[PDB]
Amino acid sequence: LTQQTIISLQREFASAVNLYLIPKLVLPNWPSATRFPRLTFEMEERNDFSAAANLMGMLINAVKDSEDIPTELKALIDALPSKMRRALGVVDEVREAVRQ
Amino acid sequence: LEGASVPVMSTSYDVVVDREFDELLQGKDGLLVYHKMLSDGTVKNALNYIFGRIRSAKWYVEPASTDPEDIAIAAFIHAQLGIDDASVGKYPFGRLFAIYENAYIYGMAAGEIVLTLGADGKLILDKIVPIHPFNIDEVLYDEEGGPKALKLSGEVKGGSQFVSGLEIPIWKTVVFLHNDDGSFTGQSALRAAVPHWLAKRALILLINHGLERFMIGVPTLTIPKSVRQGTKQWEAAKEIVKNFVQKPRHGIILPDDWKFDTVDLKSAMPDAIPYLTYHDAGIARALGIDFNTVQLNMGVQAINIGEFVSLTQQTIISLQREFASAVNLYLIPKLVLPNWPSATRFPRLTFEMEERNDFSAAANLMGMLINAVKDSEDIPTELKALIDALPSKMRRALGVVDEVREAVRQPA
Amino acid sequence: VGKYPFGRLFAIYENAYIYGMAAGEIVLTLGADGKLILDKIVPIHPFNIDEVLYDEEGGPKALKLSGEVKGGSQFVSGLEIPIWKTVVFLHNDDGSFTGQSALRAAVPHWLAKRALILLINHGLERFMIGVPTLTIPKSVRQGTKQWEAAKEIVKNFVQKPRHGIILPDDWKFDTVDLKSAMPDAIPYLTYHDAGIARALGIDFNTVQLNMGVQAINIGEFVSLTQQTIISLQREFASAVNLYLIPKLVLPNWPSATRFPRLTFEMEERNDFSAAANLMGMLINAVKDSEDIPTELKALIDALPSKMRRALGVVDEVREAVRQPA
Amino acid sequence: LEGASVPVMSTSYDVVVDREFDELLQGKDGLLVYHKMLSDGTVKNALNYIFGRIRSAKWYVEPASTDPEDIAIAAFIHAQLGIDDASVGKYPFGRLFAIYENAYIYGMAAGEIVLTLGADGKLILDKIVPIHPFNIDEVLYDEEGGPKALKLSGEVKGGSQFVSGLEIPIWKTVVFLHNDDGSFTGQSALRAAVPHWL
């Protein structure tokens, strides 16, 4: 119940960074830029980790005999309905790009 | 084919004027009461929970149909709001919720919709200018009782100038009403909490006063009839009574015809805490919260707190629908029509229903679906086909298969 | 959520629940497809209904309205609308076409609660502060310095307790002996207060909520309350099915003899774990099918009633709408 | 393509002036009350929990789209902040949270954004200079009630000189407001706790 208060404060903080800071860092380097990256966070409302970890195991088992498990697994996850996708966590394409 | 034969009429009869019978809560004097209630810790605790839960409802855009054009228009709106997993969004998204919060507290609020030319050649949302009910003189109506404009008066932020009877047409605005009864009159959610709030404040004053007389005692000094005011003896009497209260360690030396005592109150102090917390917790009950916000986790209670949080969801889901209705009626058509002048049906802002925790059972079913299509040549396609064929309860438990999100996530 | 007018119908039904009856004017316009479509519902508040007019057989034929146009442009006096231009919501119609407020049976508990809060407020002051008494010699007369001193003592006892009381030896100060502790009226107050919600057919305590020693199974009392709320859902659906849907169908299909019906999913018990498990067993059975959706829908419609209904609605109308042209 | 016809207006009516009715909590005298409340053990216990949970929220950067260019720009920002599993980050990341904490306590705070030339040729974040509400005289507004600058007065740390009415344009700053009602006026989160504290 207390998380509904604290998540509101996280949104207030993110809004200020997204409005005042990020455009000031992007425009100098990309003067034509029309849309901007956004700072955001993972929603923590309830502890569904046991059920979510079990589903993660069932997804891996399904793509196990794949010639490229990472690619097939990421494809299968993005196809899940919203509640099921979000329970596994963030598939961070920006982290992936930085780690190249 | 004929239009309406019945006009919109005021909710007025006898002492009830535009839904209100109590003179102290009529018009802008009413707004000052609701403003003062925001300084109460129990009111603020309730609004923090309610407003937090509303924003967390997993907001998304449903298209008018599965037609590719309806999907395209829905994707434009998705992009305008910055729909995302945390409902952070682009700047104006958050501003709409802040205006709706003023409507919840005061009964009505609004924003001016400002468009600009996008890089694509499309007209896009530039900003929402918030309008506070303190700065609304009145709503103006046509001859059939339909709203046509807002009349505004107030000081420009910074104190450069006063605004005096400025009129803005309704078609340039989004208007949020709380609990509209059909007359286009909003009402503060705090209305039914006023009696409990007044009672709580009066009881805290009474307990504070009682605690001093039972904690310290009321000193009495009985002296001979010969002692008159303005004597050395008289000063000594006043000094004894004063020191009893201020300097208890001092002690009291008396001649044998002077008698000191405290008033016998003839019982223990009454325990008013249960009656105080009845009125205090009653503030949150009046907003439709179905768990005790003052005792919270303390004391002997029901085993299943989760069920009382689920009961509270029926109140908060109603507020989510009220917010969505206003966006769908006032904002989305104003963003679509400039770019698609022939448009006859519109995307709708909506949310995921959160009533019960069925996640363990739903995740287990999700696993059984994946296992069934596992040896498919294209698992995503087959899985989405199988899900849309499920009976309603089973489909909805898995979550939203968001075709608009899918269209946006198309790489160019 | 729906389109704008959907929500407006629920707001009108809410007025019917509170007051006994309410109504809305149905306004149609020409759609892009050439069809007559719903334009809007104009809500009608019972404060603005003079009466229902009846034919010679006691069937309703019109509403007579009086009220002020919103914004105060003019007063409307005895305006008559035929019933066929309206949706009418009655709460608990007994067969006579007379609605009754759901709040009727709560009035006594509401009056008792208000009277008890006044009585407790008054009692709490006399037990918390005390009623001061001052006994003085017969010689002390009104309109004297001594008389003012007496009035100042009793006033200050109430207002300024830290002040203290100095008395000559033939003056006696006391508080009235009430001869017992204050009676605990909280249980009787909460009996009447919680009684307001009992009178509306709610079967859990809405005043104590989660607090105090209780039944283990709160869920069963929420299920009992569903029998009240499902009845209200049927009352709402009946009015839409009778007054609104035929008015949307007949203009476009003048020969129409049968009509679609607004309905809802029955929510009585939480059988979701068992139902989700069965759904998994059905899928596993048709898994090696060349067309799983078709075979699965065939198998589900063949299930016995309890088992079919537990899975939810197989909505053929939703399926038709979701057809891309 | 029409401009706004309605200006931003103050939340003021009768005794309510810019959201506040109690004289003892108006303006900078108000800030002294909220500062004193920080020495209360129950206030500090609550702020420790709230501020800790905010920083622990697994912060990351979402791109404007799945387009490779939008991903590239998002990666630049990710690198500027030093996004990582513990939300430790590079020096300035932590400074933004410290400034937001002042906004929560007092109602508003700010930071000056300073850029420098990076090794790659790009303009990069050099630092955020924190601005405390004790050292803000006022926000300056345009004719439509939009904020344009901050006017500052205070003593330079170390006591070298007093600064008097220094003006910084808003485009050189990040501004944090707590619970902005639409008027660009923040409010202390501690406001509703004052009666219980007394």
Numbering used by the authors:
A (entry chain C): 336 to 435
B (entry chain A): 26 to 437
C (entry chain B): 113 to 437
D (entry chain C): 26 to 223
Relevant lines from the article:
A key step in the assembly pathway of double-stranded DNA viruses, including bacteriophage and evolutionarily related herpesviruses, is the packaging of viral genomic DNA into the procapsid. During this process, the large terminase protein docks onto the portal protein, which is embedded in the capsid wall, and translocates DNA using free energy liberated from ATP hydrolysis. Cryo-EM reconstructions reveal modifications to a canonical capsid protein fold, resulting in capsids that are abnormally large for this virus class. Structural information on the portal protein, through which the genome is packaged, demonstrates that the capsid influences the portal’s conformation.
As the previously determined structure of this portal protein was for a construct lacking 20 N-terminal amino acids, we determined the structure for the portal protein with an intact N terminus. One goal was to test whether this segment adopts an ordered conformation. This structure was refined at 1.95-Å resolution. With three subunits in the asymmetric unit, the 12-subunit oligomer is generated by the crystallographic fourfold axis. The portal protein forms a canonical 12-subunit oligomer with an overall shape consistent with those of portal proteins of other viruses. We refer to its domains as Clip, Stem, Wing, and Crown. The subunit−subunit interactions of this thermostable protein are enhanced compared with portal proteins of mesophilic bacteriophages SPP1 and T4 (34, 35). There are 39 hydrogen bonds (6.6 per 1,000 Å2) and seven salt bridges, compared with 26 hydrogen bonds (4.2 per 1,000 Å2) and five salt bridges observed in the SPP1 portal protein, and 22 hydrogen bonds (2.9 per 1,000 Å2) and four salt bridges present in the T4 portal protein. Of the first nine residues of the N terminus, five are positively charged, and thus may mediate electrostatic interactions with the capsid. To investigate conformational states accessible to the portal protein, we performed normal mode calculations with the crystal structure. The lowest energy mode with 12-fold symmetrical motions exhibited periodic compression–extension of the portal protein along its central axis, characterized by a synchronized up-and-down movement of the Wing and Clip.
